[PDB]
Design an enzyme around this catalytic site. Structure first.
Site, PDB file in Angstrom:
ATOM      1  N   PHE A 113      -7.116  11.484  -0.642  1.00  0.00           N
ATOM      2  CA  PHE A 113      -6.491  10.457  -0.632  1.00  0.00           C
ATOM      3  C   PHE A 113      -4.960  10.654  -0.962  1.00  0.00           C
ATOM      4  O   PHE A 113      -4.060  10.371   0.119  1.00  0.00           O
ATOM      5  CB  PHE A 113      -7.113   9.214  -1.680  1.00  0.00           C
ATOM      6  CG  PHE A 113      -6.454   7.962  -1.323  1.00  0.00           C
ATOM      7  CD1 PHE A 113      -5.765   7.484  -0.406  1.00  0.00           C
ATOM      8  CD2 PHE A 113      -6.634   6.963  -2.356  1.00  0.00           C
ATOM      9  CE1 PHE A 113      -5.175   6.253  -0.135  1.00  0.00           C
ATOM     10  CE2 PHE A 113      -6.119   5.800  -2.070  1.00  0.00           C
ATOM     11  CZ  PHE A 113      -5.375   5.412  -1.069  1.00  0.00           C
TER      12      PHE A 113
ATOM     13  N   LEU B  21      -2.705   1.391   5.095  1.00  0.00           N
ATOM     14  CA  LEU B  21      -1.222   1.218   4.196  1.00  0.00           C
ATOM     15  C   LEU B  21      -0.187   0.906   5.249  1.00  0.00           C
ATOM     16  O   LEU B  21       0.748   0.490   4.638  1.00  0.00           O
ATOM     17  CB  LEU B  21      -0.931   2.364   3.473  1.00  0.00           C
ATOM     18  CG  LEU B  21      -2.165   2.844   2.418  1.00  0.00           C
ATOM     19  CD1 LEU B  21      -1.644   3.977   1.596  1.00  0.00           C
ATOM     20  CD2 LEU B  21      -2.749   1.360   1.503  1.00  0.00           C
TER      21      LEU B  21
END
Length: 163
Positions: A59, A121
Site C-alpha cells: 500500500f 486517492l
C-alpha cells in the site's frame, strides 16, 4: 528544472540506503516547495530525524510527522495547514509521492510514498513527486511494516537535503 531531494534512511539507527525524489514544481509549485524546504530544514524545522510511523506493505509508507511522531502532528512552511493546490497528477503506481490530509484543504507535512497503484486517492490527495532513485530502498523499508501499519523497527530519516 524540477528539484531533487534525498532521504538517507536508517533502521534502528543502522543505515539502509538513500531514496531520491523528483518534485513536480512545474505542476504543483506550492506543494513541492513545502516538501523541498522541509527536506533542507532551511526554515528552521523539517524532516531530519523524523520517522516513518505507518508502513503497510502493498500500500504505502507514511511519514512527515516531525512534531508528534505518530500521525497526529506536523506543520507546513505556510502554517498549520494549507490548501489542496490541484489534482492534475494521479496515483498511477509505485513510487508516487502524495500528501496525507484529514479532509479538504488540510495539508501539513505528512506524506506517503505509494508502493502500489492507489487510484481511489485520485482527486482527494495532492500528488507532487515521484521516487527517482532508490525504489529498492523503499521496497526494503516496506518489509518492516505490517497489516495495521505498525513498524517492527524504527525507520528514520537520518539525513535529508537537496541534490
Amino acid at each position: 528544472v524540477n528539484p531533487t531531494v534525498f532521504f538517507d534512511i536508517a533502521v534502528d539507527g543502522e543505515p539502509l540506503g538513500r531514496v531520491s525524489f523528483e518534485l513536480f514544481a512545474d505542476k504543483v509549485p506550492k506543494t513541492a516547495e513545502n516538501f523541498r524546504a522541509l527536506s533542507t530544514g532551511e526554515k528552521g524545522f523539517g524532516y531530519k530525524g523524523s520517522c516513518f510511523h505507518r508502513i503497510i506493505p502493498g500500500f504505502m509508507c507514511q511519514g512527515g510527522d516531525f512534531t508528534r511522531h505518530n500521525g497526529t502532528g506536523g506543520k507546513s512552511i505556510y502554517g498549520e495547514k494549507f490548501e489542496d493546490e490541484n489534482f492534475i497528477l494521479k496515483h498511477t503506481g509505485p513510487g508516487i509521492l502524495s500528501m496525507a490530509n484529514a479532509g479538504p484543504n488540510t495539508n501539513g507535512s505528512q506524506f506517503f510514498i505509494c508502493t502500489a497503484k492507489t487510484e481511489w486517492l485520485d482527486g482527494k490527495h495532492v500528488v507532487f513527486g515521484k521516487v527517482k532513485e532508490g525504489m529498492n530502498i523503499v521496497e526494503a523499508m516496506e518489509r518492516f511494516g505490517s497489516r495495521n501499519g505498525k513498524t517492527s523497527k524504527k525507520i528514520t530519516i537520518a539525513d535529508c537535503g537537496q541534490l
